Amino acid sequence: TQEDVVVTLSHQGYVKYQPLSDFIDRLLVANTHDHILCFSSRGRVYSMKVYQLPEATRGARGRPIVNLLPLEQDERITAILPVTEFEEGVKVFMATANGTVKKTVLTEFNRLRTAGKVAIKLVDGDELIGVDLTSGEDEVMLFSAEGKVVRFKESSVRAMGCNTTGVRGIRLGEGDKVVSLIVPRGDGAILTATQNGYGKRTAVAEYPTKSRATKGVISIKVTERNGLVVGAVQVDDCDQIMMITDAGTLVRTRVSEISIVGRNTQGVILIRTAEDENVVGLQRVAE
């Protein structure tokens, strides 16, 4: 009984599926027999076949993902990856907030249970914030809150088993942390945004390629004026952006109406911050 279905996840946390016929966070098109891997902030991975999801269909409904998976109180989902086949040459690449990174071959997740298991062992106080698939000559980019960045080859990271810690990715200054992981694909520009509402773009070609475990270079100058970096993401001229504050205000924008400048700039306000209010989310709008 295999066929194409649509799988949606809402910003609020509800998930469902249905044959082809809060606000939308991610909309995917898959086959009833594809798999879906979910990674958490505590370094665990939970697996479930697409047909084991709630078939709500139509408009509205669907249960919260936190009610399908046996998660702990402060444990959240940081990445969701669709998988059709567990091919031999692909890897799972992980990045933590204290600057650590690690990779494992996709074949190790082939027969996982819904109850989950350890994907990466964490030192006290750290957490998994980024996960993606990689192969061949792919490169990796790590962005920090104080405006730094480093870019290197996935091949320079040695493959390891599921129950290990990993290696050094970026040397952070005291108090700084990693907020985004990017595996670059194409000529799209890199868009970055700060807490007080500032933002700008820079050609991905303007980001130098160095080595892992260093302090990296500047991606955007941060001061008391614009504040800390909330996130970074690669996008296309046709795409749209969304920013959310801790207050609740939401603003969408057209990537094309945002100037492409050098890495040493502070950007221009794109959304009226308003004292005592911070930007806490940045992402491409669900297409």
Swiss-Prot record:
**Subunit and interaction comment:** Heterotetramer, composed of two GyrA and two GyrB chains. In the heterotetramer, GyrA contains the active site tyrosine that forms a transient covalent intermediate with DNA, while GyrB binds cofactors and catalyzes ATP hydrolysis.
Highest taxon, organism lineage: Bacteria
Additional record remark: Few gyrases are as efficient as E.coli at forming negative supercoils. Not all organisms have 2 type II topoisomerases; in organisms with a single type II topoisomerase this enzyme also has to decatenate newly replicated chromosomes.
Its family remark reads: Belongs to the type II topoisomerase GyrA/ParC subunit family.
- Organism phylogeny: Bacteria, Pseudomonadati, Pseudomonadota, Gammaproteobacteria, Enterobacterales
Which region of the full protein is contained in this chain? 535 to 841 of 875
Organism encoding this protein: Shigella flexneri
Location within or outside the cell: Cytoplasm
Q: What does this protein do?
A: A type II topoisomerase that negatively supercoils closed circular double-stranded (ds) DNA in an ATP-dependent manner to modulate DNA topology and maintain chromosomes in an underwound state. Negative supercoiling favors strand separation, and DNA replication, transcription, recombination and repair, all of which involve strand separation. Also able to catalyze the interconversion of other topological isomers of dsDNA rings, including catenanes and knotted rings. Type II topoisomerases break and join 2 DNA strands simultaneously in an ATP-dependent manner.
This protein is called DNA gyrase subunit A
